[PDB]
Design an enzyme around this catalytic site. Structure first.
Site, mmCIF file in Angstrom:
data_model
loop_
_atom_site.group_PDB
_atom_site.id
_atom_site.type_symbol
_atom_site.label_atom_id
_atom_site.label_comp_id
_atom_site.label_asym_id
_atom_site.label_seq_id
_atom_site.Cartn_x
_atom_site.Cartn_y
_atom_site.Cartn_z
ATOM 1 N N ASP A 80 0.837 -9.734 1.445
ATOM 2 C CA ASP A 80 1.650 -8.529 1.345
ATOM 3 C C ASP A 80 3.300 -9.334 0.533
ATOM 4 O O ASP A 80 4.030 -9.470 1.937
ATOM 5 C CB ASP A 80 1.936 -7.268 2.425
ATOM 6 C CG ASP A 80 3.135 -6.741 1.976
ATOM 7 O OD1 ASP A 80 2.740 -5.983 1.051
ATOM 8 O OD2 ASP A 80 4.050 -6.482 2.825
ATOM 9 N N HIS A 91 1.013 -1.339 -0.038
ATOM 10 C CA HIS A 91 0.001 -0.099 -0.221
ATOM 11 C C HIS A 91 1.137 0.954 0.406
ATOM 12 O O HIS A 91 0.423 2.617 -0.467
ATOM 13 C CB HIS A 91 -0.549 0.373 1.428
ATOM 14 C CG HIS A 91 -0.383 -0.414 2.207
ATOM 15 N ND1 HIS A 91 -0.093 -1.979 2.945
ATOM 16 C CD2 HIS A 91 0.261 0.430 3.751
ATOM 17 C CE1 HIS A 91 0.232 -1.586 4.183
ATOM 18 N NE2 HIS A 91 1.261 -0.445 4.245
ATOM 19 N N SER A 94 4.151 1.508 7.881
ATOM 20 C CA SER A 94 4.146 0.439 8.039
ATOM 21 C C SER A 94 5.305 -0.230 7.570
ATOM 22 O O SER A 94 6.564 0.019 7.507
ATOM 23 C CB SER A 94 3.261 0.455 6.816
ATOM 24 O OG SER A 94 4.091 0.470 5.888
#
Lengths: 52, 49, 151
Positions: C50, C28, C102
């Protein structure tokens, strides 16, 4: 008109009977988030499965 | 001609067999492909919990 | 440890950790990597797990050893604090949970990575983290709470 009334008066005794038993499925288990439901009653006998 | 020719008058038994082979096998080869994605989706839900 | 921030337009917006056998990067977020030898890593998209491709050679292999299942609910070495639960993430206090950080790993007491964070900006009084876990035998699981904005 009688025949479609017999089916309709018996269909309203289904959702008052199937969902009555379905409301008695998960309320012993919605109060126990640390307990695991059996797979016989999770899918076959009752509708709603485990959600995370 | 004494008779009337229909739409399926010329199709023989061998030509009918090739029609069922070339339709049934290709339909089942998508159905198996569609049911393959409905297996790992149920497996992935079991792997989450 | 060894983590690499992602360079996008001059500011930090994500962290790309490395696990032994395969490197990672959040999908993302976007930008450029901060390593010259990681520029040859083939970028690809994947599912919600992911998943990236760790094609780094043997010269910098075996950095952070992974951890197996049966994770105890005890103390964990979070980079800005600690996490003390197993099935869910611990309710981290306010302040932590900003933006653009992240992919930060969660360490064990033995120096082993057990998880990679993905999101959970803010939920209100407490904060829940959408993090990846291993369920029973090593199968990769992505776990999310309700209403978790990516972070």
């Amino acid at each position: 008109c009688t025949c479609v009334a017999i089916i309709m008066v018996s269909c309203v005794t289904s959702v008052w009977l199937l969902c009555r038993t379905r409301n008695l499925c998960i309320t012993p288990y919605k109060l126990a988030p640390n307990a695991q439901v059996p797979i016989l009653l999770a899918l076959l006998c009752c509708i709603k499965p485990t959600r995370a | 001609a004494q008779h009337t020719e229909s739409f399926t008058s010329a199709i023989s038994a061998t030509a009918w067999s090739w029609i069922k082979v070339l339709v049934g096998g290709t339909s089942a080869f998508i159905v198996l492909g569609l049911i393959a994605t409905a297996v790992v989706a149920l497996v992935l839900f079991f792997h989450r919990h | 440890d060894k983590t690499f921030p992602i360079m996008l337009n001059g500011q930090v917006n994500g962290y790309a950790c490395v696990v032994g056998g395969r490197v990672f990067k959040p999908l993302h977020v976007e930008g450029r990597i901060d390593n010259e030898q990681l520029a040859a890593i083939k970028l690809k998209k994947a599912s919600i797990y992911d998943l990236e491709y760790g094609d780094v050679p043997q010269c910098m292999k075996s950095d952070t050893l992974q951890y197996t299942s049966d994770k105890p609910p005890g103390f964990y070495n979070w980079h800005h604090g600690a996490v003390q639960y197993e099935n869910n993430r611990f309710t981290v206090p306010r302040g932590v949970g900003g933006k653009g950080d992240s992919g930060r790993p969660i360490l064990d007491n033995k120096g082993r990575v057990v998880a990679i964070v993905l999101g959970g900006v803010n939920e209100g009084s407490r904060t829940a983290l959408s993090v990846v876990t291993w369920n029973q035998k090593g199968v990769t699981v992505k776990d999310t709470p309700e209403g978790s904005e990516p972070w």
